[PDB]
């Protein structure tokens, strides 16, 4: 897993139907780091340090073994920084 | 903390049992009691995530066989700045 | 058998014969020859005890004669 | 009290027995005796509803067999303000 | 005395005989006579209970074959203070 | 009102029951209670035609089984101007 | 009067019914209530002879079926002066 | 007179009857009334042996069918001086 | 009010239950508790006839199965002034 | 008044009929009409115990066939002094 | 006289006869007459042992057929010095 | 405390057993032992509601087979304030 | 000497007999004798549990066939301090 | 009395019956009555814990067959400080 | 009861001959006292004559522009019979892309080509010059 | 508070749960935790009889599903002064 | 006294009940409590022989069904002087 | 942190595994290790509520199949002040 802070939300209307009705959140390892996007399996508010799982694990953390997700927020860190 | 525990019940007796249990079982603050209509009463508590998880668990168990029972017991770790404005700040 | 001077009833002696054959209880000062030798409840009957140890009044009278505002 | 009790009788002798019984039995005021005509005499007793109930029942049980007898034993717990103008306030 | 004796009769002739046979018979006072209506006349006599009982039996036997006949013969041994209003307190 | 309701009854007790029922059942005014003679008492109300109908029907039901009962229950939706002279203007 | 009515009963509830009945039926005075023992209560009245006969026939009928019942109902028209020492002069 | 006559009865109404009967029947002296307990009342008279015998015979018949009845009718022509301590000197 | 409702029971436990049941059930005031003797205890309340009717019904049902039980339940809508002397005014 | 009467009904139209039947029936005051929630309306009346008894029986009989119907008809002859704080004093 | 002799009877009349036969049959001293409640009366004598035995056989034969009868006849030749506290010393 | 527990018995021996079991089981206070007559002895205890429930349960079990036994075990968590004037404050 | 022995009997003769037997049979002091009403008398002893268990056995043997008999033979090995107020002191 | 008793009910008639029974059974103060919605009403009482237990067990029994009945009957012996804000707290 | 009768009758039509058995508190009641699952029809089980705002699948109650069989005029024979017409017997084949959807087609081109060519045999039929699978 | 409430558990985790549940459910004092051996741990609390009843019930429910479980739940509403020696005054 | 009574139980809750039931039952001193291991707890009492026989029977009945129950209840009337060393003198 | 996690095991090897796993799972402080008796060993940690919840869940999984197994894993987020007396502060 990686510790990434939520920066904002992302919205793709043309997203594949396999993504389902699942929120997507821009994330980064620090402010200024490359911005990734993760399926928000938990409900995370912007500014939340979060735990993000990579491929295979992220597909079942996002709801199905066949889910199109290589990144998913599996939790919010009780306290970081 | 900014976590939310909500325990909806059918009636206010299960809600008051749910809110006693939640408040005695963890360091959470009862922020509101809402009458929604149709005999649904939501007791909402606010505190750090672990406290809210312990509290919601105790409350659900407590209010389950009291009266018409538990409709829902739900934990929200972090609550959006927008959901804050639909949430009672202090109990009434 | 209590030998010695006897205070019991005799055929020869008289004046000691009121209640001589009566069963008195307590110390036996006379022989069982004449007197001989489970009570369970009070033997005196009482008015209250004679009857096991509904509302009467002016509402009870004229059962079907009166008409008018009913009460319940 | 405003409850009205009324005993019509066939004669004044059953009526006087009824007025006596009603007054002795319960806390009722004798408000009037009326000669209706045809040998009908009414006795009207105004008191509280339980009192008037007790009075009318005692009166009926009393005048039932005296004389020609009892025509009616009636209670009206509230009489309309209109029916008041046809009710005697005090007996003569 | 406060006992009341009452004889109801069909007509006036049978009640002037009963009124006469009453007051002669025992120590009673004729307090009044009333025309009830429908052909009934009531003669009332106030005395002690012993006297009124003699008077009513006398009056009753006296008027039972006079005229149309006797309707009621009633004795009251104490009259309530409220029936007093519906009773004739008459020099008559 | 211009309509007339009338309930004749055998005695005063059935009539007071009729008047009470009638005057509570609709907006009618008790204009008279009349001792006709022979033990007939007539209660008269004047109201709108609809009120008098509701009222007379109510009065008939109330007094039917009280005392000697009801003789007549009648509605004249408009009395002639001349019948008004033979009709009471307020109760006695 | 000096006649003596005495009603014994099995209880104070049948005795108070009897006292009320007796002291409303005739012109008698309640001179005493005595608790004999065994549950026997005696209500003694003093009046003229006819008055006391009427009162004691009114008391007996009344209390015959109130509570445990009526034991005795006895009139003594004259009482020896000796017996007056064993009789209550007032009910306290 | 030194003789004792004693009538025990179940209740006080029969005892008052027996005391009147006894005092009237002979020249005895009503010397006391005792509430034994269990609803037994003992009336005691003192007079000459001829007087007391005459009195108790009358009292036994008088109160045999008044109230609950006679328990005992007894005559002691001479009481031992020891017994006079447990005997009432005057009625209370 | 001047009505009188009275319950007689066999023992004190049933009577304290009756008094409590009655004074909880209606607008009555407990005026006395009497040990008649031989295990009869009479509890008495004075109120309005409707209140006492409601009070004695609830009191009689309450004490019916408590201890040895109910002997008598009895309402007197109007007590004669003479019975007030033998009636306790306030509980001692 | 002290007695409370209450008619619960499913809907206002059944309750208005009960309020009218109750207030017409006896001398009771309509102290409140409350919308409980879920279509339950309670009509509350305070009068004497006799009137409230007669009234609540009138209401229950009237509203039973009106609309959805009657849920309850209850009389509390004297509410505890504490229950007064949760009882209306005047309808709104 | 240290012996005690005791007769218990159903009533006071057998007890007084027993006290008379006991005190006249031997040199005993009548010390107590107790109402034990329930219609039990105990006459207690105190004399030498032979005197007491003779006295109690004589008392029992005297009161066996007087009134309700003899419950117990019992002699105690020496009484413990502690039972003498609960024993009366002079008849009252 | 204000809860009242009452164990009536047939005799003082079953009531001294019941009082010992009550007082030892919980923190109650014997507020009075009563002789009601007839043999009935009532043991009244006043303590907190939890204590009185425990005490009366212990008392009823203890005296059930002792002597003539238990008539009634009865708890009133709060008596009316008028039922407290017929309650003993201290044992005699 | 803290244990209590208690014999209830039907009469004072069986009780005095039991008291004698108990006090003679073991080291127990006779503390009191209580008349309970209805003919029950209770003889209480106070001593050690063996002294008392031996006295109450000896006492019940004495008074079983004396008079009307024994009702209860009970031993309380330690008496609660509260129950000592309802217990006669030793000068009795 | 910081304990809390609550009784939810379907309708208000059941709830006023619960409040009345609760405040008549034990030493509990009525703090509030609430309209939850969907026809639910909650009466809340506060007193010592045992008192609240007795009160809520008696309220449930009384309100169970009145109206639509009992939904819940609960006791919270110690309420948390937070829950006091969501609780009515208004005997006054 | 006698005289002027204003009680409900079947001979005098008007506003008091309606709601018979639904009205309580009448003199008669006081004397005696002594549907579709969905508002809108199923979408599959109906086809509307005029679509759009002319739809009649939903049941609008009230005063609503619908017309009983009693009412005549505007549509029906009053629009249908005005002009004479003869419907001839010429129902003929549609030449269209949709009618040619199930035309007979020649055997599908295949590929025996080897080597790396992106030779997918599972997708839509791409074709090269001469009908050669591509 | 002098009532004791003891819960016995198999293991310490159920006992700490019971201590917590008992101390938070009622105003009771945790007086001790005893390791009895054989994996039995007793938690003893002390408070008023109602607080101890509530606390023990709470503790039992709470510990019934934590670990090996509940062996016992007991109350001693009054504890002998001898047992205060084997009871722990303060948790240590 | 030097008699030893010894209740043994599976757990301490049954043992505190036994100790308390043994100390309230008779005049005995709790001399110790032992944790023997394996769940076993032995409460030991010392007093005169009958005191101990009545305590060890009260204790056994009390704790018989409490916790895991009773293992042993045994009385030794005199213990050898060598067994006094393996016996505690005062509780710890 | 003041939250209490605790894990009980059937032995010490499972307990050490739990303590190690709990201390390693989250920032919690191993405050005590207890030999309850019978082979029950409890490990207790104190930390922030989320940390303790994370610790106890990981400890229980670690020791479930280690040795004879796990008995309990309990989290208490708010511990009462009274229970903190029976909780160790530093391990031994």
Numbering used by the authors:
A (entry chain P): 1 to 81
B (entry chain H), D (entry chain F), E (entry chain D), F (entry chain E), G (entry chain J), H (entry chain M), ...: 6 to 97
C (entry chain X): 615 to 651, 685 to 700, 712 to 730
O (entry chain Y): 702 to 735, 770 to 869
Direct quotes from the study:
Among diverse BMCs, carboxysomes are specific CO2-fixing BMCs found in all cyanobacteria and many proteobacteria. Carboxysome shells are typically composed of three groups of structural components that form hexamers, pentamers, and trimers. Here, we generated recombinant α-carboxysome shells of Halothiobacillus neapolitanus by expressing all the shell proteins (involving three CsoS1 hexameric proteins and two CsoS4 pentameric proteins), together with the C-terminal domain of CsoS2 (CsoS2-C) that mediates shell assembly.
The cryo-EM structures of T = 9, T = 9 Q = 12, T = 13, T = 16, and T = 19 shell assemblies were determined at 2.3-, 2.99-, 2.93-, 2.75-, and 3.04-Å resolution, respectively. Fortunately, the density maps for the T = 9 (C1) and T = 16 (C1) shells were retained at good resolution. For the T = 16 (C1) shell map, additional densities consistent with the CsoS1B C-terminal helix were observed at the central and terminal regions of the CsoS1 hexamer. Although building the structural model was challenging at this density, this result confirms that CsoS1A and CsoS1B can form heterohexamers during shell assembly. Collectively, these results imply that there is a correlation between the size/structure of the shell and the incorporation of CsoS1A/B heterohexamers and that CsoS1B is probably highly abundant in the larger shells.
